[PDB]
Amino acid sequence: SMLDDAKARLRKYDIGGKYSHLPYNKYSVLLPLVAKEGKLHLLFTVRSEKLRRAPGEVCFPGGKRDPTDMDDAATALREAQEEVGLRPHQVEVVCCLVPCLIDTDTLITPFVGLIDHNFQAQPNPAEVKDVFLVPLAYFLHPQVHDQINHIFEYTNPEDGVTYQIKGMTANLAVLVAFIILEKKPT
Numbered sequence: 001s002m003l004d005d006a007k008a009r010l011r012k013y014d015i016g017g018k019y020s021h022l023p024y025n026k027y028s029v030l031l032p033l034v035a036k037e038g039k040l041h042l043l044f045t046v047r048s049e050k051l052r053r054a055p056g057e058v059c060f061p062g063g064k065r066d067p068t069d070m071d072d073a074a075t076a077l078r079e080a081q082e083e084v085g086l087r088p089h090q091v092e093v094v095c096c097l098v099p100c101l102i103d104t105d106t107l108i109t110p111f112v113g114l115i116d117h118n119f120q121a122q123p124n125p126a127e128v129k130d131v132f133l134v135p136l137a138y139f140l141h142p143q144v145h146d147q148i149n150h151i152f153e154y155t156n157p158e159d160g161v162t163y164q165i166k167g168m169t170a171n172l173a174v175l176v177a178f179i180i181l182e183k184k185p186t
């Protein structure tokens with residue numbers, strides 16, 4: 001099936017707990033995979049205009065590890081629940097991808113999660129202004145704009161709204177798209 005095929009490709013890139021104990025300032029992100037109308041999509045958030053770190057930007061659900069978290073995957077699931085109301089029975093965490101190093105003292109660990117078909121996002125307005133889906137295949141032929149820095153523009157055909165996706169978030173999307181969609185019969 002489409003979903004079994006996805007998890008099997010994703011598992012070949014799992015680095016597991018290899019880098020998880022290093023003494024960094026630690027953040028996790030959830031890369032939420034949704035199946036809709038026969039195809040895979042990623043779920044994104046637009047950050048509230050109120051936040052100190054990066055108001056108004058497109059990002060994956062996530063945030064800073066705290067003393068309650070049993071492990072880095074727990075940080076990502078705690079944070080997704082708080083931002084968009086995703087409960088634990090509604091997500092299967094399939095792997096841990098390569099972590100992202102920033103600012104000399106920070107390590108961001110990405111987890112890929114398969115989302116239940118009956119999940120419906122409840123955006124928390126203190127943290128997220130909007131939630132939207134993008135088909136995974138878009139990231140193989142994106143509409144690119146240069147600000148030199150590469151920016152993706154995605155227009156939702158449901159309503160004509162344009163979102164800008166850039167930086168680490170855009171890098172991770174392309175990575176997931178490659179892993180899952182490369183080399184497939186049609």
Ligand SMILES: CC1=C(Oc2cccnc2)C(=O)C=C1
Binds near residue numbers: 117120121122
């Ligand atoms: C994650 C998920 C879907 O997408 C969305 C999009 C926006 C808000 N909530 C859910 C869906 O249709 C089935 C599970």
